[PDB]
Symmetry: D2
Subunit: 115 residues, 4 copies
Amino acid sequence: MLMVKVLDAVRGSPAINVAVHVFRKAADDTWEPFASGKTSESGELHGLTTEEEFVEGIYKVEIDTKSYWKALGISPFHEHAEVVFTANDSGPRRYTIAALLSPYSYSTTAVVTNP
Amino acid sequence: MLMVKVLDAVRGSPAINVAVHVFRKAADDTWEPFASGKTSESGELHGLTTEEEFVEGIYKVEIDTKSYWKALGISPFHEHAEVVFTANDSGPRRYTIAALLSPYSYSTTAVVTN
Amino acid sequence: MLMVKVLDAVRGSPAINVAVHVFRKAADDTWEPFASGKTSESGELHGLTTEEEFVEGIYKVEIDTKSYWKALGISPFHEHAEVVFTANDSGPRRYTIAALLSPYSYSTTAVVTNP
Amino acid sequence: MLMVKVLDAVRGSPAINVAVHVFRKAADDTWEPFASGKTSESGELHGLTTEEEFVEGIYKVEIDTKSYWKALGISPFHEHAEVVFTANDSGPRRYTIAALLSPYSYSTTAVVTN
């Protein structure tokens, strides 16, 4: 129900092997680890969660942009990119989180569809 | 030495009266309040820090995008936008953090000049 | 070999039924009509061209953003979004042209892969 | 009354010495040169027009992005970036056309203020 897609705006390609960590805000206001993975050769990350597991709450997706640029020999500005949102508060939805990466800039977009 | 600029991509205007909070990373890996304010009529926020207090370290700029959209009666996706970066003395000195806001998308850009 | 994808950053959804016109620069420096279509319900447009037809040259993709926003009751800034690029100059490639639309802003990204 | 600002997203800096050409649509649906220049050290271009010459109509701003990237030795995708818009007297008066450049992506934003 949660997919992450990452593009490289410098090379015009998917961002491959980018680490992604997802957290869920617990009842005590701390960030609990929820899921993690790495983008595939198409720059996508699927299978982070199931419908039963993906309950209502506040989630944070943290994308390790810094390691990505370093391995390409570029010293980027940001430590990472994070996306924080409330999910499922009016029923289950499919969430696609897209990120477009440049060394000193990034964009993030959400596409939300009703399964 | 740190300047924040916020633009509204729906109305083509500065994003006015947006709350901004700046944090510095402490030794215990905790975020401590450092500065804050609200963007002006030109969507800018200046005078958050001085060259003396702005030492090397990791900083987080949090922009309350959700309240901005709610005031316009538009339902947004993100809870806020966060920009996290390391400040380095070698060797460019002025940091402009720009943010371009839409309800389901934002971009942020850093302009670092001397 | 040419695909166009359009997203709506105001609604968090694909941009559906957006008109797209593609032109190729002729030998006399004029823009010849090459192909056209409308984005589907996933905001995508496939099948604009074939490999035999998609020769080396300069192409322009014009996306009718203005009609899209008007039909939603918004008066946008731009007349359209156009993307102009040289294609296939070092052999056939697959081109994905992505556009992210807001009323007073747009972004366009190209993903180029080797078939 | 028309201002162009260009930023480089790879180096986090103003895009300096970028060529900009502005055209106005003629009755024959043809584009006629109207103004031009090169961005300054702050990546800005001012004084392209006056309030008197800037009448209602359709304008095209063409930014030579390809030459900018080539000078840095980076191969870009686009031939240039074009921004086409209608200017309207009712009723906000100053137009800032911003562009944020990467080799395979650009964004453009209009800020229209009074």
